[PDB]
Amino acid sequence: MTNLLSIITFLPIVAAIIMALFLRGQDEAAARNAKWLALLTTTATFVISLFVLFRFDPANTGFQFVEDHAWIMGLRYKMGVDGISVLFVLLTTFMMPLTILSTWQVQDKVKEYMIAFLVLEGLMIGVFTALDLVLFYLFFEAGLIPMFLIIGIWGGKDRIYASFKFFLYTFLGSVLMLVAMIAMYRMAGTTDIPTLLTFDFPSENFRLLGMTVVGGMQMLLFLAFFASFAVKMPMWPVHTWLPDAHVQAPTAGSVLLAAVLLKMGGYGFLRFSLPMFPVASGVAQPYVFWLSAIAIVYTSLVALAQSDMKKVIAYSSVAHMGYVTMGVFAANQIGVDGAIFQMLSHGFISGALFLCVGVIYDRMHTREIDAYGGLVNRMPAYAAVFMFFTMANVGLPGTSGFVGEFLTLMGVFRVDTWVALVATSGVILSAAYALWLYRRVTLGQLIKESLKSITDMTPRERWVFIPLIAMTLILGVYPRLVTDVTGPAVAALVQDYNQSQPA
Amino acid sequence: MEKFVLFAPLIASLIAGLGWRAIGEKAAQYLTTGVLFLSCLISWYLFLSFDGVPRHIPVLDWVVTGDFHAEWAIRLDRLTAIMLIVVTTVSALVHMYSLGYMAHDDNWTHDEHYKARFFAYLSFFTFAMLMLVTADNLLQMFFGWEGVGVASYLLIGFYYKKASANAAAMKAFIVNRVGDFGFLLGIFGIYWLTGSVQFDEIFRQVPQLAQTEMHFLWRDWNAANLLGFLLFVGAMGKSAQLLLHTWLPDAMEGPTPVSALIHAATMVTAGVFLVCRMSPLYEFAPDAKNFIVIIGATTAFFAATVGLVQNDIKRVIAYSTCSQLGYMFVAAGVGVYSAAMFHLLTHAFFKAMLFLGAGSVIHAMHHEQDMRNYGGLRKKIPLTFWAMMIGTFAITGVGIPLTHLGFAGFLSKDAIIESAYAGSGYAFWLLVIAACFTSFYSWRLIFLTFYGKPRGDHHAHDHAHESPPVMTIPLGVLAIGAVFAGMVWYGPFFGDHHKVTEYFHIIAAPVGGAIYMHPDNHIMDEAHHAPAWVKVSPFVAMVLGLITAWTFYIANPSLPRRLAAQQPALYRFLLNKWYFDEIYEFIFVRPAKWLGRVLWKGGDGAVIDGTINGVAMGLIPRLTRAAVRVQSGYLFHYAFAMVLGIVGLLIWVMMRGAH
């Protein structure tokens, strides 16, 4: 119980190695064993990570559960959590058992499917626990490998193109960040994230090529990290990989792609860009505001034009991340708390919606909106669940969707009214595409022979959704469960950002 | 005791909505109906025993972040107590009325189950409105605000197999979201100017807010005027005021009992209530009130003309609600919020009855809604005829002209028309003209349905019969409000300035009172002192419209047909409801869909993906083909490359020089 973060990080990876070695047979019993072994492993990781959650002390804004060991090439293996990153660990471990349970009907290469998800979980958890600069980059980039194969092997008809675009687009943005990490390593003489959080990187302007670089070295380091996190988030206009990868991935892949991997971009902004490059962040605030405002309006209108149900959900995520980006760079307590809440909240809602798509994809094997209609007539439970998360997706008060949206909008209002006015229009636009999709798929008359015999959600499918409905309602009604944890850490973060602004 | 009223309807709806299978449909219906009645009794006790000391009952913390804190809390002042009896009374009756109106529905086949779901929606709808009116802070007011939006969308689209209902419910949600866009911007502005979203703390700081300049978009604004305008944009959408009205007429696609609850208790009254709850701010915002009147008065006129030519019974009553809410916004704008609440309270009674009355007609007439096929019916439906007649009496304002004795809407409307004269010449004249149009379409409704030759298919006409007692007892109880309510509460709401002050327990900071009226405001007084030609004009115009209705349907019944032919373009304009929907489809809907497809295919596809693919799949492969070509396989070419490399490097070394 002194290496708790290392256990939850590498336990899923170790289980995959054992499964790959000592699990034999390709029959259904052999596959049935793999599903159970994965489910027990993901459940174990979630339970152990609850010890972190409840022993965590929100008042302490330092890193807790810290473990440090020597490593290679003069680096250190250091892990830990604070009020900004603890909840992203629990979100990852929370979605993984539900994601496994939703694949229970997959019959194609099951053992390999389970291994890819078990390996992916360990690497996703490492991103949020790592306190070494290179160690963060290792988990940040290693996650591309299992996801590249998850899309390639189990994806749709365009999965070859989607998997390559996903990997290379993300890979391109992070290699620039790698060089910035090497530069910070050389200036500060350390890769320790706690030590880099107090280091003062130079901000005096200089000239590079034909332009002045406002912010000096901080701006150059800021732009390298921005390229990595902007693509990961994703921000507009570097988002066009997401409508491919999220759509062409298998349903389980889409859940983890949207619920967890997107949060690495926003967490990157909260861990590095604002603490380590405050002067550059202050300078970039106007541009980030309008890119995020454009993203909300742009992708909301693009979602309204989609003929493919899974693409509506994919484009919805880009709009929801636009709020997160604005909240982070408003750099006030209200905006940053809203940004973190919006990230966690979007994990439950977006994941649930991709599971709603899978429920009817499994039965009908199509994603065209026009291929459905009046499903409420045969699928009462599905229409209720799909409606609930449709309403959460439009930020209805009472669901967790509202809180994150509301606070990021109010934090931005304090800084820029034009941005807040444009971003706030998302409430009108989100309702438009979200309700139209729900109506066209679920409501109406059952007038197609194909849908005549469609079945309702099975008991297993209902039980996957119940935890997600619980978190959405609980956090919507009692968000203090989140802000108590993140409150003190955001307060310290916002204070350092202010104390670093040029005077 | 207050918590039971607030939370009992939610618990009943959850039990009935999700667990009716365990306990059966009948137990679910009675649970919701019975629990509403108990809360209605507790609401009346809270209302009639209020001593004038506002109470604050906390429940839970909602949103805490740094200095921002909003809580689930219950505030009980005069305004809350008034809205309680209005919401619970009408909701309780609508539950009873629904026990018979939905007893056997033709929209559903016998396999489908709807009764338990319907009563759960009504209970939750009641819960949302109750949460709205008991709000202690602006954020909880928003939850209920959006709560009625989702409950209405559930109920307006109750018949999910009817594409007309699904479109109508979607429209209501979106249009009300356009209103919530301004509401939200007001909440953001208020928090940053005052550091709080709690009503009392906001009101304490209002005097400074009136002297404050706030930057917003391209210029600085007086804070109070801007904030009052922004919060009013929310009220316009929720009350179906002008330019945000098109959703209310289409809400008829839901069941008739839903229309009564939306149009008299829960949804439309929210906008006026917010104006009256936030009066401590609008009193210090002279320009915001100006805009409220112009919208309020123009809506009363706009919605009166359109009602003249509509042929669907519910759509006539639909526009009457919009026009009536126009009146209450004029009264608040002129600075008389008690009169606005007074008409809101009286309106709840006779408007609910008119809709519950029209449900009986539709229910009796084999569910036909076109008034062109509604002749006779007076002898076939005795009680619904008189209840509708009482509703017409109240809304028209049938009383003794210069006295203080008459039906509910006679007194409350006169208070608004008297205040309009003292407050705005624009307001006073449009209201009486609308009051003239009100009488025509109200009595036109009576004569078309309850008089004349039995007109239309004889089958239903012959089979027409009075609906069971469950649908008529709620109508009767309402009638006990659409006659005596105005006389009962005239004094406490409008009669005497001292009487009004104690009832509402109202420069000093405008805090502690249910409403506030700035000292420099005396419109309520000037209304009393108004001349006699003011105090009688409503009676004159009401009669004037009545005689035209009598002249148009009993005698010379061909006049309505002939006139449209004389002035046909003005017939289409009213019939098409001033073409507002067509304008929006042209200016908003079609452009939005077109914009999304262009951004989707032109932006993401041609510009962004076209570039990325053009480089990744166009350029780099082109450089690959050049590299493959240069690897020619000829030994002499490879040696040439080595010689070019040395020669190029030597040129480089020479330029640097010896050094």
Ligand SMILES: [Ca+2]
């Ligand atoms: Ca720092």
